[PDB]
Amino acid sequence: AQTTLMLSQKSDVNYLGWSTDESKVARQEVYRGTTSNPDLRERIAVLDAETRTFKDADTNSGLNYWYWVDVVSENQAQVVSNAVTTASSECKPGATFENRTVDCGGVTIGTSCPNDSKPLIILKNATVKNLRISASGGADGIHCDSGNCTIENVIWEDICEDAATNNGKTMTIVGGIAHNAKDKVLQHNSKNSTTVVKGNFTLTGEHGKLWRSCGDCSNNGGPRFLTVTSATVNGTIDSIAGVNRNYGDVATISGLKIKNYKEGKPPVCEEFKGVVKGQGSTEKYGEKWDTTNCKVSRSGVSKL
Numbered sequence: 001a002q003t004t005l006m007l008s009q010k011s012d013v014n015y016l017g018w019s020t021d022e023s024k025v026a027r028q029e030v031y032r033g034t035t036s037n038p039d040l041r042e043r044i045a046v047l048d049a050e051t052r053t054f055k056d057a058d059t060n061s062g063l064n065y066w067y068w069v070d071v072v073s074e075n076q077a078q079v080v081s082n083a084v085t086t087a088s089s090e091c092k093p094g095a096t097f098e099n100r101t102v103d104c105g106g107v108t109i110g111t112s113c114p115n116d117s118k119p120l121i122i123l124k125n126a127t128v129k130n131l132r133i134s135a136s137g138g139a140d141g142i143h144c145d146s147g148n149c150t151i152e153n154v155i156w157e158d159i160c161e162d163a164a165t166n167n168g169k170t171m172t173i174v175g176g177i178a179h180n181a182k183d184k185v186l187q188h189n190s191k192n193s194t195t196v197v198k199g200n201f202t203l204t205g206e207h208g209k210l211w212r213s214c215g216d217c218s219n220n221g222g223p224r225f226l227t228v229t230s231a232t233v234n235g236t237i238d239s240i241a242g243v244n245r246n247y248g249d250v251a252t253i254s255g256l257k258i259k260n261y262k263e264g265k266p267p268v269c270e271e272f273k274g275v276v277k278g279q280g281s282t283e284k285y286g287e288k289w290d291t292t293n294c295k296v297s298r299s300g301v302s303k304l
């Protein structure tokens, strides 16, 4: 197998994002050192088998750091990633991948962020992994335009418009770090489709919503589904999910951690009235728990 590791430095905190193709994961260990020498690294954490991200806030600046992540299987096999520090050619803006998995090997891409009224990567029943979207060249992020798409270990240094848009059947977010400065992270426009969030997808900075079933799209309708099983918001966010109840949307949220979380701060699942473009405006009903459209108990959300 293989483990590909990437690092994002935001607000004096080091965020690690990795993808692994190991099958029966038992645990994952994070190693950190003050030099390049792997032999001098030390275990600063032993994590569970599902997370694909890690936050190291116990670092002092002025000092460079090297990181490695060791993915261990049930058969105790150890798949150590490449080193990342604070010190393929197919992944370029405007690219379209179809019916395959493209490993971007941790490269950075971007164009620019327009000022008016443009997808960076379009996936048609495909998967993209180990990709970093630059701070200025975000455009309209990643578009899943058909079939099942997986966006694995993608780091958004900043979000220009939308981080990822589900215009397909199923959009799965596995791990990844999404940063934004003052917004829509996951935009869902297709109908009879699902958006899955796991691998502890992490949002940092300032955000609007983690996920929003389009409220006023042209030819709007539903149903649209969201299933969050693992995610973390280490910053401020207006709300987590926005469902159109009149359209049959269902948001199921568990395994979510939020920095300084408190009832209504921020609201998690909110119900709206969806409208067709031009035929009115979208009104917010409010935050809801354990309803037909908002399937999330207070047990599924906790303070980071």
Ligand SMILES: O=C(O)[C@H]1O[C@H](O[C@@H]2[C@H](O)[C@@H](O)[C@@H](O[C@@H]3[C@H](O)[C@@H](O)[C@@H](O[C@@H]4[C@H](O)[C@@H](O)[C@@H](O)O[C@@H]4C(=O)O)O[C@@H]3C(=O)O)O[C@@H]2C(=O)O)[C@H](O)[C@@H](O)[C@H]1O
Pocket (backbone or CB within 6 Å): 162, 165, 184, 187, 188, 189, 208, 212, 213, 214, 215, 216, 217, 218, 219, 242, 272, 277, 282
């Ligand atoms: O004509 C189209 O179909 C259009 O689709 C894409 O754009 C999407 C929406 O059509 C567009 O109006 C916008 O919508 C978002 C959000 O999804 C929508 O619910 C609404 O959000 C309101 C409020 O305006 C926001 O500021 C915030 O407070 O949230 C509110 C809410 O009810 O949740 O308006 C939003 C917005 O204006 O950005 O973006 C949608 C998107 O997928 O990005 C295409 O991008 C567009 O070109 C066109 O094809």
